Amino acid sequence: HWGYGKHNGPEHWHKDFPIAKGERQSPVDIDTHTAKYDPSLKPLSVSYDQATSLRILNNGHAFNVEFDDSQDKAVLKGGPLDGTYRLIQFHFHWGSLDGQGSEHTVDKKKYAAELHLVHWNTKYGDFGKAVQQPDGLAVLGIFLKVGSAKPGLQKVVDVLDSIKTKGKSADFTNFDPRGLLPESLDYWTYPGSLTTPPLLECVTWIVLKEPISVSSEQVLKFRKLNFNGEGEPEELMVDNWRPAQPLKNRQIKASF
Ligand SMILES: COc1ccc(N2C[C@H](O)c3cc(S(N)(=O)=O)sc3S2(=O)=O)cc1
Ligand SMILES: [Hg+2]
Ligand SMILES: [Zn+2]
């Protein structure tokens, strides 16, 4: 079944998910010089102060930190969005080396990792219904750059030994997602898709202009995870990213 290996990675995805060849697939290259500065874009409103994390889980493709989305506890509004979008989980895509790992690239430059904060549009009642809609999800994408440690990332990094193999989870309450945001909330936005199977074109992508820094030992920890379940041969979880797709008649708008 799908993964990121030679035999089941991105280039093979189209056979089971034909939408991989669709019209608004993600990720894409953000060419800064032809993105259109749109003056009618409102600022983003990230209200993560009431966020309730529940659990961290290795799912064989990445580790996800899941949040309680039963009430409007951590939401995203504003920007290009019409409506309130609830936070349900965040995850990362990273490389085996520091020069690759992001999914979106800026002027073809790749970062060491990319954080995705997944939100679903509350007018659709639940996540399941939201993924049936063109404006069902908004994902906030943050590039991670190697340098100085991000203190808010360290709690995540310390629990990764308990969830080394596929299927393991550990309770992960009281984690505050605000410690992973950059200073600026300037962004690029375009209509796109999920970047893993099922590749549904349900997403308004909001990619922040400002990267956050993590140390190499923090990102090293990411690389010790396993794609495999325990008792299986070990495959290190590295390079779990999809290459950029053609923009195909889409324009990227810049809030700046
Ligand atoms: C059957 O219903 C479902 C439909 C979709 C999903 N997704 C899991 C995917 O792995 C995936 C990938 C995302 S990314 N890299 O941000 O573009 S977001 C996301 S998901 O959590 O929405 C789960 C259940
Ligand atoms: Hg959709
Ligand atoms: Zn992702």
Side-chain angles (χ1 to χ4, degrees):
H1 266 107
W2 81 272
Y4 293 93
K6 184 209 280 282
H7 296 114
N8 63 346
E11 343 72 55
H12 291 266
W13 289 352
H14 68 108
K15 288 174 291 166
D16 276 284
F17 306 92
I19 192 64
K21 300 273 170 289
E23 303 305 276
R24 54 169 278 197
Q25 285 289 291
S26 297
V28 298
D29 177 48
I30 291 165
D31 179 30
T32 55
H33 285 280
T34 46
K36 168 58 181 62
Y37 167 57
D38 184 8
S40 48
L41 249 39
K42 282 79 191 72
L44 291 173
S45 180
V46 182
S47 310
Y48 290 166
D49 58 279
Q50 336 78 292
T52 302
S53 46
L54 302 168
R55 182 230 240 173
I56 185 165
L57 166 93
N58 177 334
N59 67 14
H61 301 294
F63 57 83
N64 292 170
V65 171
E66 303 162 358
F67 292 81
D68 169 40
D69 65 321
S70 50
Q71 287 182 110
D72 288 336
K73 293 187 172 192
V75 297
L76 210 205
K77 301 126 292 169
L81 309 175
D82 309 323
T84 296
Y85 286 65
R86 281 184 191 150
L87 177 65
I88 181 168
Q89 51 97 344
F90 70 74
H91 53 271
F92 300 82
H93 293 272
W94 54 97
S96 43
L97 281 347
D98 301 328
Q100 54 185 40
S102 63
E103 299 212 289
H104 288 84
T105 50
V106 174
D107 296 318
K108 301 304 218 302
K109 170 186 174 58
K110 297 176 171 66
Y111 285 93
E114 182 168 334
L115 170 55
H116 292 154
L117 292 132
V118 187
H119 310 65
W120 60 269
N121 192 335
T122 53
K123 61 177 153 176
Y124 298 121
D126 60 50
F127 189 75
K129 308 303 185 302
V131 300
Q132 295 183 242
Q133 302 287 149
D135 61 340
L137 304 177
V139 185
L140 235 190
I142 292 170
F143 298 120
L144 273 64
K145 182 194 74 182
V146 172
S148 317
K150 186 70 175 181
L153 191 66
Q154 195 59 43
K155 187 177 173 182
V156 176
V157 171
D158 291 324
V159 79
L160 296 190
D161 288 320
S162 60
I163 58 144
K164 191 186 167 61
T165 50
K166 175 197 290 195
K168 281 180 174 171
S169 57
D171 295 309
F172 194 72
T173 55
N174 304 109
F175 179 76
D176 186 354
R178 293 177 308 183
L180 302 179
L181 302 190
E183 294 190 353
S184 186
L185 292 191
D186 286 345
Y187 64 86
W188 294 284
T189 190
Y190 74 94
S193 66
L194 303 179
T195 61
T196 74
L199 304 158
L200 304 174
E201 303 186 329
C202 302
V203 186
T204 287
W205 271 97
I206 304 166
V207 179
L208 297 190
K209 177 199 189 172
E210 189 183 315
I212 56 167
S213 296
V214 294
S215 55
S216 44
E217 302 66 45
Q218 290 188 311
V219 93
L220 241 300
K221 246 49 62 55
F222 285 18
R223 298 181 185 141
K224 311 291 206 71
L225 272 350
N226 282 171
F227 282 131
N228 59 279
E230 72 163 291
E232 293 173 14
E234 184 158 336
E235 308 164 69
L236 294 174
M237 187 175 290
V238 285
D239 290 321
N240 54 346
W241 50 273
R242 182 196 199 184
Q245 300 308 312
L247 193 59
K248 290 191 166 83
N249 313 288
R250 286 181 286 178
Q251 66 155 346
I252 297 162
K253 298 198 261 65
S255 73
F256 61 96

